[PDB]
Amino acid sequence: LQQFFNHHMFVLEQEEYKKEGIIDFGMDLQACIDLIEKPMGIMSILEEECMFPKATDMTFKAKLYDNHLGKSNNFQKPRNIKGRPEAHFALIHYAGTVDYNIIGWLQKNKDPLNETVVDLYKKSSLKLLSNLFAKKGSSFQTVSALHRENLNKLMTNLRSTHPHFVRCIIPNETKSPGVIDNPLVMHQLRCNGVLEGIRICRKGFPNRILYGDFRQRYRILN
Amino acid sequence: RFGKFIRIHFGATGKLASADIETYLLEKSRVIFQLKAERDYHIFYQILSNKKPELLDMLLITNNPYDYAFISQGETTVASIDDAEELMATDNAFDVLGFTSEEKNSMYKLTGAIMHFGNMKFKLKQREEQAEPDGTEEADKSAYLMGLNSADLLKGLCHPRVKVGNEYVTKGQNVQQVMYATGALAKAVYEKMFNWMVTRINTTLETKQPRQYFIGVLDIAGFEIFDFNSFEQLCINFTNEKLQQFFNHHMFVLEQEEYKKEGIIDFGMDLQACIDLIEKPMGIMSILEEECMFPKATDMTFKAKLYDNHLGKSNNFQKPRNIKGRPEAHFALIHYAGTVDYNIIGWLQKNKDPLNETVVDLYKKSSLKLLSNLFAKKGSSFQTVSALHRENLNKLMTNLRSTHPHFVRCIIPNETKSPGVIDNPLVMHQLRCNGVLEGIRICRKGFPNRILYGDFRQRYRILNPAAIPEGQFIDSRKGAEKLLGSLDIDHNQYKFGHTKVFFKAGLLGLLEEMRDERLS
Amino acid sequence: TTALVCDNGSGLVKAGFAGDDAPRAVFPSIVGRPRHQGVMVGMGQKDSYVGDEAQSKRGILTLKYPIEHGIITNWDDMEKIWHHTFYNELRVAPEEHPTLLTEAPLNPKANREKMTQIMFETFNVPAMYVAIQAVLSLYASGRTTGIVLDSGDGVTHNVPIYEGYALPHAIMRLDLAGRDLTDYLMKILTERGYSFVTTAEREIVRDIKEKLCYVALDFENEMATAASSSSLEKSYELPDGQVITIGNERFRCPETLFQPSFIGMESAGIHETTYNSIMKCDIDIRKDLYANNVLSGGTTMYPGIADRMQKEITALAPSTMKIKIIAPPERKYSVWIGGSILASLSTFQQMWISKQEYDEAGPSIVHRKCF
């Protein structure tokens, strides 16, 4: 979604800069998606890691360190501060260095759709008869794969539209007057992607001043 | 011997909620090693008393303090104390409190379980080193008293099994290390039982009010200077030394606050060097700890090493003068109480705490209270009384640095609970042993004479006035500047401020030697 | 801080913190490259299996020892052994930890200096030390005096120490040790019919050596017994089956410690290099050395080497002199445990070779006042 924001800002900022006569910003995020979406990426390595006979989660971390430690700039070893329980790899997203825990991804990644039980779901006299009514992945389709397809379908639904973003944040734990706790607003500054669109416009010229506006206020300068 | 710490816990806006205790520094060597002018803790003497015969039948005790090895190195009994009165205290506290009735049996089971440890011979095998108990009657009585097995205790004391890599290996021992093991397990289980009992009394003392922001009150033993200052006495002396170190910094922040209010080296450094001699590595507690690790290091070798490392190298450390026929003195530390000698002999035996691990496993397996009591690594086989003193004192310190002190001193008049026959050696000795004379002399290095300007004019304008009396017609800062401009006193003697004026110790008697010339 | 008492070893590597009974990480010092291809794709196997991970995958590896006889012969392997030791077995970064290494007597100077280069340059230890592997087994044994017999897996050295002063001249170093005994048991199990040429079963026959072998009290009497009787024919189960029945090849492997003429070693046994090491000392300190003969090292853990050693060293000594052998049942790890005594001493804090003391004087700082 933030990747759609960066291109969508770049086309508008490009429109004003071509009106005035004055690398894409989405590339700033693209590498992280390059680490995640593309084959030989972390979701793909997690998907194919299941297919092996005896591949445990420790073998999966060994394979991620085999493929991406130093090969890709986003992927980096996890520092653990303040007594986190365990951290196994870190991705510097647009929010920054974000660790992860491998343990148990191979159990939750799997979605083997048992076909004959789906046939018995069709045969049963209930709502399910109406609910459950080159092939790909009859025995090996994973939560990462349907996440990839549903996210691509949301994307191609969203690339056919024109966005108008709204952000919305909570003050603190209490539905309260002005006792706003700045760790929460500084954290949801980066988690909502607000600080990103703050810093993307800084790489161009954000100071958009009119000439007569520069003369009614800042001719006083010199 | 130990320290009390009674937190009277409050609420949010000062309403008494609860109270808890967490005692510090129960002396292990006091349990094992007793000086002839000293005694053990009272519980063993209570069971040795014939006040309750059911414990004597129960614990297989021979009615005699002289008989047992723990209770014969020291004194059996002294005047002004009665053992049946001590048991009269404990059965009153044991009959009604928060606990059940079985633990009243269990605590006595553990004390009389300590008693049968040390009598075991642990004879050396022929042409070997491993000490085999062949005289196994008394540790059999122990294993009946605890609930441990009879043979497993003897095998575990004789052959401690340790974990290497994955697979266990046993080591042997000699007679010496197994005697330090059978003392070390006793002192460890006694201190953990006593801390457990502090938690059991804490279960009674805690009530379900919301506990917040305690105003807790600690008690501790006094910095005591005998003719036989030993490592036991070092365990008191360095503790109260560190408490006095907290006092010097705590005075310095307050005196700094008033002197920065008025506009006028740290004092803790005055004590720091002594702690530098004791706490820091290559210090006397550290040299005593590493002295044990050598193969053949006796106490004479330890004194030779202390003289090698600190004679002249550190200003505190100095050779012991012996006056008035002290028995023997081996090194002297000028503490805040002054030159304090010490006796090396026997520190290496009482310093040791080798916690025998497989016997702790058998302590876990036994069906008693102990199953609940005894349930990068450091010092599995080399942990010492000095090390746990260092850690418990540091934990008391970081408990105490999170608080704000308000000191109370309390002294005895003399030996008799008496009217005014106070014997001045005792008050002069507890003047320095309580650290009172230190805080007396620390404030003297600044300006202690804290006099207000109008207070300097209502009383000491009489010293050198003008031709007109007081009247309150000059502002009191200038009304005292008019005074000090004619007292013939140099600038280095006083320091001028804003709200008050201060003077060095030795001036408010100079404010009356010429005033008696005025009042002649 | 805490100091790590490492031990390079020769067939086992033990590493633990100063302040423990036993070392926290004991594993063989092997580095195995995989010989075969790997038809399964995506398995992601490493180019170098090291340590105890390479003890479970032995039937596919070419196991190599980076320490042949005391000396490190391949440093690119020994760096992997140390890296696996700190990062995987102990899981501590050595940046904030001193490190006590233990190196045998009479090693090459370049071995000790190169070891110091690998410790300061690569791992960046703040202050390491290199201590003599026989003296630490005198710390652990609780003796101030006495000849110590550190029969390691790699090399066997008979250092004497009197009143804490080691005697440099009397130190006897013998190449014959547990590795060469394992090669000789590979040599004499072929005499029965069970072939062992692949180094992967080097760990099989050594395990036989751990279980079955024992030093016999007499040799010609036991060779007169095992050739006629069958009470010594003891079997063993290999990891596939075909249980093997070792008879007179049982006490004949560890006898090569006492008869080096079995494998063409010129020298006398370690029951006589001990005696030549005591006779090399002065003729007044010998009385404490005959009483305080220490045994240490994994190779000394045979059942009955403390009685055969005492029988032979009593047969060589003057018979009016008391013979006692101090061998606690932690013979193998006694080189480490005294190291856990060594780095835990407060007086040892001046002995560390600091990095500031290293960079001023280069790698030759080890043979100066700091050792």
Ligand SMILES: Nc1ncnc2c1ncn2[C@@H]1O[C@H](COP(=O)(O)OP(=O)(O)O)[C@@H](O)[C@H]1O
């Ligand atoms: N219980 C045992 N009985 C006989 N031989 C043993 C035993 N344990 C170890 N060894 C032999 O001793 C060697 C391992 O001992 P160790 O002292 O750890 O060697 P290193 O010091 O070189 O690591 C191996 O060659 C092994 O076969």
Ligand SMILES: [Mg+2]
């Ligand atoms: Mg060794």
